[PDB]
RNA sequence: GGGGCGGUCGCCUCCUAAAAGGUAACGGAGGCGCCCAAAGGUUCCCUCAGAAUGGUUGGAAAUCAUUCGCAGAGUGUAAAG
RNA sequence: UGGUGGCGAUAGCGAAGAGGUCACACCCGUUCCCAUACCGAACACGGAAGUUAAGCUCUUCAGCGCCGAUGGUAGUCGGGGGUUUCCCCCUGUGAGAGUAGGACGCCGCCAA
RNA sequence: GGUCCGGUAGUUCAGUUGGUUAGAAUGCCUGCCUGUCACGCAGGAGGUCGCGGGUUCGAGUCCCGUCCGGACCGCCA
RNA sequence: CUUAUGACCUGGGCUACACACGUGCUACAAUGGACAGAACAAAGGGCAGCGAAACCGCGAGGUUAAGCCAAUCCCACAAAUCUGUUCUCAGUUCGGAUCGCAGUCUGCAACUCGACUGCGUGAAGCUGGAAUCGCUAGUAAUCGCGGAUCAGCAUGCCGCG
C-alpha cells in the first residue's frame, strides 16, 4: 500500500433483506442487500424455495 | 500450476551480471556472500587459481546466536570473516554481492567488514 | 478470511482425499484475481478511463493501473501512446475479500442470471468470466455511473488440469 | 432494486412501478392495493417494510427475466414451426392481416 | 563505347571481388546533406515477436490470463556486422 | 551434501525412479527498515507450523539436440593434353549433409 | 526509340499539396408548379480513386513497375 | 358453343408489397392527461325485431327474461361542458402503433380473411420543405348521437342536435 493513493479499507458487515450475515470488508462501512445467495433461487441449490415456475404444452378444449 | 521461477535461478543471472564487471585476483580477492533463508555465508575467493582464502558462516561451531539469520548474525559473521582475512591478512577486498540488493543483512556484513578493518 | 478459514479447514482436505495426493501441499490454490478494464477509447473522450479508474478503485480496495497499449493499430484509430484500459491485481486477504463480495452479493444482483458458463476454461485450470454491468456491490453510487461497460474477471489457480479447478470452484461457490 | 430494475425516485409509486417490465398501470394498481402501502406515496420517502412486502408478490407474478425469454421462446417456436404467421414474423410483414399496400412502416 | 541530347559529379552500406587488404565499367541494389535535452552518462531491475486457449464493448487484430516460444522482435534512420 | 569456478551442450532438451534428521528450497505474517508506474509471488522484513510437491542431487535410457576420422568422391596448387562458353591425365592436397561409434558430464577449491 | 505529363460519381473538373475528411457543376431519382411538356422550386444517392507491388499507425494523394492516352525530341554527315 | 367464352362443385384470389400519389382518421400535449361528481339535445329505428329491470362475469358479454307492431315499451347512461383532487413540462400518467398471452360475439367455418374485451409490451411523432386546400356567423372549428348496407364488419356515407 502506497498510502494516500489507495482508498480506505475497513470491516463492513452485510445485512441481506432476509437477515443473513457475512463477515465482510469493503471500502464503505455497511451494505443493504436485497437478495442473498441463500435466497436467490439459482444459489438455492436448484430452486429450493423461490419459484413461480413451470411450462407445459397443453392442448385442452374440453370444457 | 503457473510457472514460478526459482529465486536462486533468477539470482544466478544477476550474480553473473555483476560478476562480469568484477572478479577477485591475488591481493585483491573477491568478497562473496550467501543469503539463504535460514543462514548467511561469507566466502573469499581467488579466481586466477580457483581457490578460496577465507570463509565464514552462521552455522559455524562457535559464537552461535539465536538470530542465525538476522542482521546481528550478519554483522557477527562479517567481522568473523574479517579476522579470517586478518590472520592470513590481505587487508584489501573488492565487493561482490551475490545477486542481492545492498540494503539488508548483506549491508550489515559490509560495514561489519568495514569497521573491523578490511579496506574495500 | 471466512473463506480462508473454510478453505483451510474443509475444502483442501476434502479434495485431497478426493484426488489422493501424496503431498498435502500439492493442493490447488487460487493465486491471483486480476480485474482488467478495457475502454474503446480511440481518442473519443479522455474522461472515460478517467472515470473508470476511480470507479474501479471503489469496486476494489485500491487504485488500479492504467494499462499501456503495446502497438498502434489504425483499425480503431488507435495511436500508440495514448492510454487505453485499466488493470488491477488482487491478492492476499484482498482476493478472498473480493471473491466474498462476488459470491455473496454480486451475481445475485445481476439483472438476469443463469448458471455460469460450463467451459470458459483455458485448458490448464484457469477461468475467465465476463460480466456486463458495473452493479457489483450495491453501495457503488449507482446514480453517478454513465457508461455501462461491465468487468472482466480472471481467476488464476495452481491447477494443471481443468477438472481440478472445475471441482474446486464448486466448493468455492460458483454456480454451473 | 425492486426486481433488478431501478425506480425513478421522485415520482408516485403507482407511476413508478410501471417502468419495470411486466406490469402496466391497471395491473400495478391492484397489486399495490393488495400490498396496502397507501398507493399515493412518493417512493423517495417510503419505509423499508412497505418497500419489501411487494417483493414476494412480484416474485409470484412474473417480470422481464422470465417474460422476455418465454415470449422469445414462444415466438421462435412460431418461427421454426412452419406457420404462415411465423414466416410473416420472419419476413417482417404484418401479422394481424393488415394490408401491405399502403402502410406498416412501423415494421420493415 | 564519336559528339549532341539523355544520365551522372560529394559522402555511407552490400554484391560484383577470384576465402588478407585493395580492385574498374554509362556494372547490379539502397540511403545521406538529419534527428535525439534525452532516443545521452551512471546505478538498479527485467526479456521479446508470433501462435494456441478463455474472456463482452471486441473483432482478424484495442485490454487482460495461462502455456509454447534462440530470437522470427527490436536495435532513431539505408544495408551490412 | 551445500557455496563458487574452469572446460566448445561429449555439459543440453526429453522420458521415467528415488531423497530431505542436516543443508537447500518451498512455507508463515508484514510490525519496522525497504517495495509493489496496482500487490509482501517481487524486492526486502523476521521465523520454522509441515512439505519432497516443485526447485535441487543422484540412478537408467541414444527419442531429439551435440561431437565425430577412417577408404570414397566434389573442389583445388603445380605440371601436361584436347574435338576448348568446356572436359581429360599425373605428383600432391583434401569436400559436407554419411555412417563406424562417443556422449543423457569432467576437473577443482571452502563449509559436512 | 528516349524524356516529361496526367489516369478521380455516368460526363466534365477540383481534392492529387495537408499521408490522418473523398468534393463541385452537370446528369439521374422523388416531390412541387404547369392542362401537358420544358424551364423554375424543394429534397437524395453515387465514386472508394488506371492496375499491380513496396514503406508506415495509417496512403487518393509517398516510392517503384505494368497498361492507357497526350506533349517534346529523335540531330552531324 | 353446347365434346364451351354455357352450367355445377370445392378451395384460392379480389385483402399481395421493394415504392409513389390522393382522400380521411389519430396524435405530437398542462386552453392538457388521469380519477370522482353534477348535468344539458335533436333526429331516427325496432317482429324470424328492439329486447327492460334483475343476477353472473373485471370486461367484451352470458342467464332467466318485463314491455313494445310503439308520442306508452325498447334501442338509449349523449358527449363536449362545469366543480373538485392529482400529475408538474418530460418522448412524459403524451401518443398509442406493432406484436405475445388469455378470451367475447357472429357465422358450417374468423388461416389467407372480421370485429370486440382483459392483459403485458410499448413505436414513430416534441406542429411538419417546395407548395397547397376548405370556409362570410349557428358558419368555420370541435362534441357526441342515429340510420342504411346487415349473421358478424364503418375512421366511409347520409342525417341529427
CSV table of N, CA and C (backbone and C1' of nucleotides) in Angstrom, one decimal, chain C residues 32 36 38 40 69-70 76 120-122 124 130-131 149-152, chain E residues 49-50 52-59 61-67:
chain,number,residue,atom,x,y,z
C,32,UNK,N,-4.2,-15.6,-8.1
C,32,UNK,CA,-4.5,-14.2,-8.3
C,32,UNK,C,-5.8,-14.0,-9.0
C,36,UNK,N,-9.4,-6.4,-15.2
C,36,UNK,CA,-8.9,-5.6,-16.3
C,36,UNK,C,-10.0,-4.9,-17.0
C,38,UNK,N,-11.2,-2.4,-20.0
C,38,UNK,CA,-10.9,-2.0,-21.3
C,38,UNK,C,-11.9,-1.0,-21.8
C,40,UNK,N,-13.1,1.3,-25.1
C,40,UNK,CA,-13.0,1.6,-26.5
C,40,UNK,C,-12.7,3.0,-26.7
C,69,UNK,N,-1.0,0.6,-24.1
C,69,UNK,CA,-1.1,-0.1,-25.4
C,69,UNK,C,0.2,-0.5,-25.8
C,70,UNK,N,0.3,-1.6,-26.5
C,70,UNK,CA,1.5,-2.2,-27.0
C,70,UNK,C,2.0,-1.5,-28.3
C,76,UNK,N,-8.9,1.0,-35.3
C,76,UNK,CA,-9.7,1.7,-34.4
C,76,UNK,C,-9.4,3.2,-34.3
C,120,UNK,N,-15.6,-22.1,-19.8
C,120,UNK,CA,-14.8,-20.9,-20.0
C,120,UNK,C,-13.4,-21.1,-19.7
C,121,UNK,N,-12.9,-22.4,-19.6
C,121,UNK,CA,-11.6,-22.6,-19.1
C,121,UNK,C,-10.5,-22.3,-20.1
C,122,UNK,N,-9.3,-22.3,-19.7
C,122,UNK,CA,-8.1,-22.2,-20.6
C,122,UNK,C,-7.7,-23.5,-21.1
C,124,UNK,N,-5.9,-25.4,-18.9
C,124,UNK,CA,-4.9,-25.6,-17.9
C,124,UNK,C,-5.3,-25.0,-16.6
C,130,UNK,N,-17.0,-13.0,-17.9
C,130,UNK,CA,-17.3,-11.7,-18.5
C,130,UNK,C,-18.7,-11.2,-18.0
C,131,UNK,N,-18.7,-10.1,-17.3
C,131,UNK,CA,-20.0,-9.5,-16.8
C,131,UNK,C,-20.2,-8.2,-17.5
C,149,UNK,N,-20.2,-0.3,-19.4
C,149,UNK,CA,-19.3,-1.3,-19.7
C,149,UNK,C,-18.9,-2.1,-18.4
C,150,UNK,N,-19.3,-3.3,-18.3
C,150,UNK,CA,-19.0,-4.1,-17.1
C,150,UNK,C,-17.6,-4.5,-16.9
C,151,UNK,N,-17.3,-5.7,-16.4
C,151,UNK,CA,-16.0,-6.0,-15.9
C,151,UNK,C,-15.5,-7.4,-16.5
C,152,UNK,N,-14.2,-7.5,-16.5
C,152,UNK,CA,-13.5,-8.8,-16.9
C,152,UNK,C,-12.9,-9.4,-15.6
E,49,A,P,6.4,-8.8,-27.5
E,49,A,O5',6.5,-9.4,-28.9
E,49,A,C5',6.9,-8.6,-30.0
E,49,A,C4',7.0,-9.4,-31.3
E,49,A,C3',5.8,-10.3,-31.7
E,49,A,O3',4.8,-9.5,-32.3
E,49,A,C1',7.8,-11.5,-32.0
E,50,G,P,3.3,-9.9,-32.1
E,50,G,O5',3.2,-11.4,-32.6
E,50,G,C5',3.1,-11.7,-34.0
E,50,G,C4',3.3,-13.2,-34.3
E,50,G,C3',2.2,-14.1,-33.7
E,50,G,O3',1.1,-14.1,-34.5
E,50,G,C1',4.3,-14.9,-33.1
E,52,A,P,-3.9,-18.7,-33.2
E,52,A,O5',-4.1,-19.8,-32.1
E,52,A,C5',-3.9,-21.2,-32.4
E,52,A,C4',-3.9,-22.0,-31.2
E,52,A,C3',-5.0,-21.7,-30.2
E,52,A,O3',-6.2,-22.3,-30.6
E,52,A,C1',-3.0,-21.8,-29.0
E,53,U,P,-7.6,-21.5,-30.5
E,53,U,O5',-8.1,-21.7,-29.0
E,53,U,C5',-8.0,-23.0,-28.4
E,53,U,C4',-7.9,-22.9,-26.9
E,53,U,C3',-9.0,-22.0,-26.3
E,53,U,O3',-10.2,-22.8,-26.2
E,53,U,C1',-6.9,-21.4,-25.4
E,54,G,P,-11.6,-22.1,-26.3
E,54,G,O5',-11.9,-21.6,-24.8
E,54,G,C5',-12.7,-20.4,-24.6
E,54,G,C4',-12.4,-19.8,-23.3
E,54,G,C3',-13.0,-18.4,-23.1
E,54,G,O3',-14.4,-18.4,-22.7
E,54,G,C1',-10.8,-18.4,-22.4
E,55,G,P,-15.5,-17.6,-23.5
E,55,G,O5',-15.5,-16.2,-22.8
E,55,G,C5',-15.4,-16.1,-21.4
E,55,G,C4',-14.8,-14.8,-21.1
E,55,G,C3',-15.3,-13.6,-21.9
E,55,G,O3',-16.5,-13.1,-21.3
E,55,G,C1',-12.9,-13.6,-21.8
E,56,U,P,-17.9,-13.5,-22.0
E,56,U,O5',-18.3,-12.2,-22.8
E,56,U,C5',-17.8,-12.0,-24.2
E,56,U,C4',-18.5,-10.8,-24.8
E,56,U,C3',-17.6,-10.0,-25.7
E,56,U,O3',-18.2,-9.6,-27.0
E,56,U,C1',-18.3,-8.6,-23.9
E,57,U,P,-19.5,-8.6,-27.1
E,57,U,O5',-19.0,-7.2,-26.8
E,57,U,C5',-19.9,-6.2,-26.2
E,57,U,C4',-19.5,-4.8,-26.5
E,57,U,C3',-18.6,-4.6,-27.7
E,57,U,O3',-19.3,-4.6,-28.9
E,57,U,C1',-18.0,-3.2,-25.9
E,58,G,P,-18.5,-5.0,-30.3
E,58,G,O5',-17.7,-6.3,-29.9
E,58,G,C5',-17.2,-7.1,-31.0
E,58,G,C4',-15.8,-7.7,-30.6
E,58,G,C3',-15.8,-8.5,-29.3
E,58,G,O3',-14.8,-9.6,-29.5
E,58,G,C1',-14.3,-6.7,-29.1
E,59,G,P,-15.3,-10.9,-30.2
E,59,G,O5',-14.6,-10.9,-31.6
E,59,G,C5',-15.3,-10.6,-32.8
E,59,G,C4',-14.4,-10.2,-34.0
E,59,G,C3',-13.0,-10.7,-33.8
E,59,G,O3',-12.4,-11.0,-35.1
E,59,G,C1',-13.0,-8.3,-34.0
E,61,A,P,-7.8,-12.5,-33.9
E,61,A,O5',-8.2,-11.0,-33.4
E,61,A,C5',-7.4,-10.4,-32.4
E,61,A,C4',-6.3,-9.5,-32.9
E,61,A,C3',-6.1,-8.2,-32.2
E,61,A,O3',-5.4,-8.4,-31.0
E,61,A,C1',-6.1,-7.9,-34.5
E,62,A,P,-5.9,-7.7,-29.6
E,62,A,O5',-5.4,-6.2,-29.6
E,62,A,C5',-6.2,-5.2,-30.2
E,62,A,C4',-5.9,-3.9,-29.6
E,62,A,C3',-6.0,-3.9,-28.1
E,62,A,O3',-5.0,-2.9,-27.6
E,62,A,C1',-7.7,-2.5,-28.9
E,63,U,P,-3.7,-3.5,-26.9
E,63,U,O5',-4.1,-3.7,-25.3
E,63,U,C5',-4.6,-2.6,-24.6
E,63,U,C4',-5.4,-3.0,-23.4
E,63,U,C3',-4.8,-4.2,-22.6
E,63,U,O3',-3.7,-3.9,-21.7
E,63,U,C1',-7.1,-4.6,-23.0
E,64,C,P,-2.7,-5.0,-21.2
E,64,C,O5',-3.5,-5.7,-20.0
E,64,C,C5',-3.3,-7.0,-19.6
E,64,C,C4',-4.4,-7.7,-19.0
E,64,C,C3',-4.2,-9.1,-18.5
E,64,C,O3',-3.5,-9.1,-17.3
E,64,C,C1',-6.3,-8.9,-19.6
E,65,A,P,-2.1,-9.9,-17.2
E,65,A,O5',-2.5,-11.4,-17.1
E,65,A,C5',-3.5,-11.8,-16.1
E,65,A,C4',-3.9,-13.2,-16.4
E,65,A,C3',-2.8,-14.1,-16.9
E,65,A,O3',-1.9,-14.5,-16.0
E,65,A,C1',-4.9,-14.6,-18.0
E,66,U,P,-0.4,-14.9,-16.5
E,66,U,O5',-0.4,-16.4,-17.0
E,66,U,C5',-1.0,-17.4,-16.1
E,66,U,C4',-1.3,-18.6,-16.9
E,66,U,C3',-0.2,-19.2,-17.7
E,66,U,O3',0.7,-19.9,-16.9
E,66,U,C1',-2.2,-19.2,-19.0
E,67,U,P,2.3,-19.9,-17.3
E,67,U,O5',2.4,-20.9,-18.6
E,67,U,C5',2.0,-22.2,-18.5
E,67,U,C4',1.9,-22.8,-19.8
E,67,U,C3',3.1,-22.7,-20.8
E,67,U,O3',4.1,-23.7,-20.5
E,67,U,C1',1.1,-22.2,-22.0
